[PDB]
């Protein structure tokens, strides 16, 4: 072997007829589809130039071509491109930018993970149609033309966008540009200049003057069809198309476990040299490049089963090529001769890569697609004795032996006389992991995860995937598909999840998402920071809260089982019946422990079963006790005593005061309270900057409420037993401190934003005096939440039985002009047949950091379709 | 110590830059003189006032009115490359300049581009901008069929490979302003692989249209002042400028083995991308530092041994401080290091400044000095904190840290707009492993032959004038013999060619001025150099008094051959050859006239082959001329043909005035019909000289009476009195004696092809026996058919080797009949002096285009930097007036 | 004299100076980018190129009298940070 083998670990393409995926390309090739259509009126009026008489000046003989369903579409915002600059960008560059992202995602890699890598980019561009259209419109004066119409930035932008550091050059080698990029990338990876390579080309047809000019040369087909290797060959038809591949050194790819589609064992390039005419090919030059590539790959030509020829369909090009192949390949052993350009026309720049992609697919499925538009070879090739043949149907691999890996030969010959050839071998024998036992493939709901750049794109994405799952539901494994959508895709800003146990169930859910009218909204996080647990106070209790979770989640049930004896120890009460009875838990000695048990088990389930690391913890009222447990400051055996011992204490002062809710800032409330000479009523909880909770003497509290109602102020009393965070609790703190004298606080390991300490940023020591202070002092919950946002957290999920502070969090975030998400872990009478997977679905939708490895330990990548795009039409105009 | 790539030697460089710079040496003179090459935009391109606006950011207007412009962009030598005028009109000028400069690069390396046919030479050409495409679509000329190759970028490199018949990889590419040096990266990589043994790298810049300036001006790139104030505190942007530059690259072990001249060694090169950093065009400091240490690692060079950095130096207020701070982090670690940038002198030659920067680096290496930076007055205050050994030279500076233990090394950098950086480390050429310098040898100062060439007459005069100026300057820096060697075996001989004979350079300067000013019409060569000339050997009538006196005194080998043949005639004819050729009166009497003509003519052909290496591709003789032709082609030995001719002249000396030669313009068929009408057999066709000229031999009275018959009928039937009526029945009685008296010779097979007028078919090999000779004095001389078969074989150059040309006019006539352009040179003329021996024939033989053995004429010598020939540029452009 | 916004802003207590600025920025970037921005996600991934940075540079100069430079927006890569950078810069010059 002359060079290092290079593995094609990812492929991406956009091709005429709506083909935008390598798997979709294979289906069309196998079906024998013909993607050559009449020129859409959107490009130009074909009848303004069509003339069947050859060589008529100013007129073309071709009215056909292979066109993309749309070209002006480009998801500009997802790449941070403003419409003003996006409009002037050559569509060839935009399609390359999009398809390169598809190529990386197809490999199972997050493109954002490639930032800072030594990845190299090689893109070939041969047509300046958008430049000419801009010149005709006279819009060259726009400053964005400097970047929009230059050819170097076609690969520069891709490297700039993804933050790559390898070579990022753009070349132009005519119709062999697509395959030349693979040869250059295979060279660069071997030299060590890079560790990953993006190779391919793009061609876009927007102007008739390119077609008529070639028509005057007699190049294009009169019948408008690339009759490759047929007697009626009369020329080619230009066609749009963009295709890219991702290349990585084989030892690295095998070491890192990336899926390998095929191995490029060696490439070679050559020039036709001096010929009769500048565009005439040379037979001996083609024969030389064949032996050069085989020598570089170190493989005998007798073992190359299938040759993917150039096959443009020119009357003189094919006989030269056919003689070239017969002198090297097909030496006795049968050989199959194919050409992708028959099915979709000549893609020019990208024709090299598309031919390669067809070769990759043929290797994987082990068959050769029939060659469209073939009846017989030209009569002048009758005497050539060779093993070559043109398949007229889906044929098995011509060799059929097992001792030798399947190999193909890919060729591409440029107009300027530059030839490219590459030898591709099938992927290595899969390093199959130990077979998954039926116990590992547990029957149970799994999250299938979607993403897109907009609401409509998500609905389109769901529809596409639903049809794909409906086809491969027997061939694909549900475990792998769940793994692939989570661990092997890029989570685009607008995202959702569908939970199901079987693929048919998954399809039905996707169709509901496809036809649903819900306004899916973009995520607010970046997966860099974990969610912030919010532990609310009392009042969220509802009848039979824990019945569903106990019957569904084992860790939740286990947590209650461990904590139940402590309640029966300190308070002598059984929480299992209270949270499962038909009546809401009542009594402070019962209400507080019941809420505490649910919250801590909810947190316990989340970071153990679903492995969600909390980025920060925020506590409100007794929720601070739950907050301490999750933060690692205390053990559950301590806070349970803290809750239980405290809970029985204010049973003495049940009814010792009344609470009021004032929807005004606390600062002005304090000033008005001071100006009124009143000092028994104090601010209890600063819930939001626009709301305040007060408590004190029951009759007096009603008096300011009436004194606020006469001022038409929105105010309300709070129907709860104990005047917490007010001087009414005074007769207990001395007893409470003695009861908590045995508490052993520890330093918190999770960021703790206490609402009791004057500075929320302080990491508390949850000693006895804290809870004494917590009950007496006011709660600056809005301040603590505000502090967490200032630190950068944006996702808050409250773990109470019912949402009570989610509205407060949203108000505080809005008061800071900050985009935040307020999720609810549980809701009153909300059925959750799938357990807490609903919250996990919501947390991912918001964008909190997750340990997807814990949810999806291992699995094989599969071919799930990539997400759609928010294709806004961005084209020049006159 | 570790070198991960093979060192690559730059064996040839060529460029075309603004201000009439057409050669690397002329670039060096400009840099030392501190020339500023940017000018106001010429009205020929566009009206600059139609777009100028000093206010930055104004829509639809450009802030700069200056640029560096080539003196002639539309100029192209279409016919030399075999491209029709129509096709060349629609070819992008970037492609046309690349084709011309690449040819200049190959010649500058000392190689004939025709010798690269079938080689594995690779071609990488950087190329940005599409101004001609913009112009073409504005004029609406895209319907032309030639556009498919004229405007497609891939043909830019494909055309070079197609023209020269190169088989290595050939591609063009775009990497913004770093494409020029990126070509060197790919070429070094391709050579390292073994894919190629020669590589052309470079780029082209062309500035035909204004909107490119307007679009960039809105972005704020364009400099308001109009000069690239590289590394100056007043930097405000760059200025675009035209320019093309190409280099030729070869593996260093191969360059040493073949003995090619090395200008510099590219030890290593590397490239990378800036990555995600602010805006698309904002450069990254850390990326620049990475490529420096990567290139050094690949080249195995520590940075402290690099003394000069050819920085990118665009002149933007953002780019320059990033460059300086990045360089100070790598280079100049305590040791002084000199900064520089070719951008300052000639603006930004986008997509080619990478190569132009490289070329400046090589010239600095060979001359060992750092050119001053033009507009530098003070570094920006932002860089006052940076501590470094770097410094910007304000005058011609000796090489920093100059020493012999460490070879001089240069770092070349070039950064593109897309963010792709290229950086290469260049070392001086290895210590000259030349032959003993000024060693004794061919120290003779005899007049040497200096060769000129071009594509047209007016081009030759321009070429002579340019070379005359160059020789006038370097008359002391180089030896005359080396210049003669360079022009002969180190250049490509274009169709229009001539030579000048001189003994010393001062005479040469006078000679070129005569050629540059003379109104001589220099016709292009008719030969392709494939086949050697065809010697022509004549009959009687060429003799004149004291012919060889000057030749005997000017060609020692001629004299040796004359002396060699002297004894045999002194035995067979009894008289010394020097008598007839040195007497003050013309030799008379066939017994001495005939041997004398044969003796000189044989030595003449001997003089060409032994002394001037002129191997004849074919040989043709006439009458007596077959004897001389037989010796030269190898059909018979030298002395044996001598006894052959003296015996004949003596044997027919028995008769005087045996008959007559009626020479008529009538065709042989027509005179045969006329003779049949006359019915006499006393006269016979003796010589078929031309299709429009026939010679009739026979009895005197039958000739004289009958030739008057055409003279009454107004027919061009002249005759000059001759001693012998050969090829006629008048010599028949002596043939029996002649058939045996000279039968002692032993003919053998010629080693050279022979066309014989004696045989019916000249192409047949003639056995030079007496019977064949007896045919010669009797059979009709079929000379016209003899030369006809020669040109049917494609031979083109015919030289008449006779004291006076007699049959040359016949060659032109038959060539005119054949509609086939041929050369009819004459070896020597009547009374014509020979101040330089037969060198006057050789210069004409070269001008005709025959095959020559230049190795024999020019055994050895070092190549020189003599200026390349000027092109016949024609104004080819697209107009929308 | 200075823009009407600058008179109002200084007359207001300095603690909301970030809040009022954080809007002069959101509105101005919204019209420049033609997209309702958010106050925390970075400009560069909105597509704020070098030109748009100039339009921001000149506009804030008219509205606040502060000479912004393109490196600063490159450093204060988000609106909240940029408004924060404007706040103390206003505070520092005021204290002079
Ligand atoms: C790719 C060809 C790419 C170039 C032509 C299509 C694009 C539009 C024109 C270029 C841009 C113009 C400027 C902007 C508007 C390709 O695959 N081509 C065919 C490859 N075949 C091949 O090389 C051999 C085919 N050649 C011939 O059949 C033969 O040379 C001709 C019939 C074409 C010419 O014959 P003659 O004129 O007698 O030499
Ligand atoms: C050369 C840069 C490219 C010059 C030629 C561009 C001509 C237009 C090409 C497209 C065709 C349009 C016409 C179609 C008919 C170069 O040498 N690049 C390296 C240095 N160049 C830089 O830009 C580096 C310094 N950059 C800057 O100063 C800033 O990024 C600029 C001023 C560009 C933007 O400032 P803003 O980001 O603060």
Residue numbers in the entry:
A (entry chain A): 3 to 880
B (entry chain B): 1 to 881
C (entry chain C): 2011 to 2106
Sentences reproduced from the published study:
MAS, a fully reducing iterative type I polyketide synthase (PKS), is composed of six domains that together catalyze the elongation of n-C6-C20 fatty acids to prepare mycocerosic acid. Using a combination of dual covalent crosslinking and cryo-EM analyses, we elucidate the structure of mycocerosic acid synthase from Mycobacterium tuberculosis trapped in two distinct catalytic states during its iterative cycle. These structures reveal domain architecture of the acyl carrier protein mediating condensation and dehydration through dual site-selective crosslinking of the acyl carrier protein with the ketosynthase and dehydratase domains.
We also obtained a density map for complex B from the same dataset with a higher overall resolution (3.22 Å) that further elucidates details of the condensation compartment (KS-LD-AT), with only one ACP crosslinked at KS. Covalent bond S-C between the KS active site Cys177 and the reactive α-position of the crosslinker, as well as the O-P covalent bond between the ACP active residue Ser2060 and the PPant arm, were determined by continuous map density. Interactions between ACP and KS are limited to a single hydrogen bond between Arg2045 on loop 1 of the ACP and Glu79 of KS along with weak hydrophobic and electrostatic interactions. In MAS complex B, the crosslinker, tethered through a phosphodiester linkage to Ser2060 of ACP, has the PPant arm forming hydrogen bonds with residues Thr279 and Thr281 in KS. In terms of substrate chain length, it is noteworthy that the two substrate tunnels formed by the KS • KS’ dimer in complex B are connected, contributing to a potential substrate tunnel sharing to accommodate C22-C28 mycocerosic acids products.
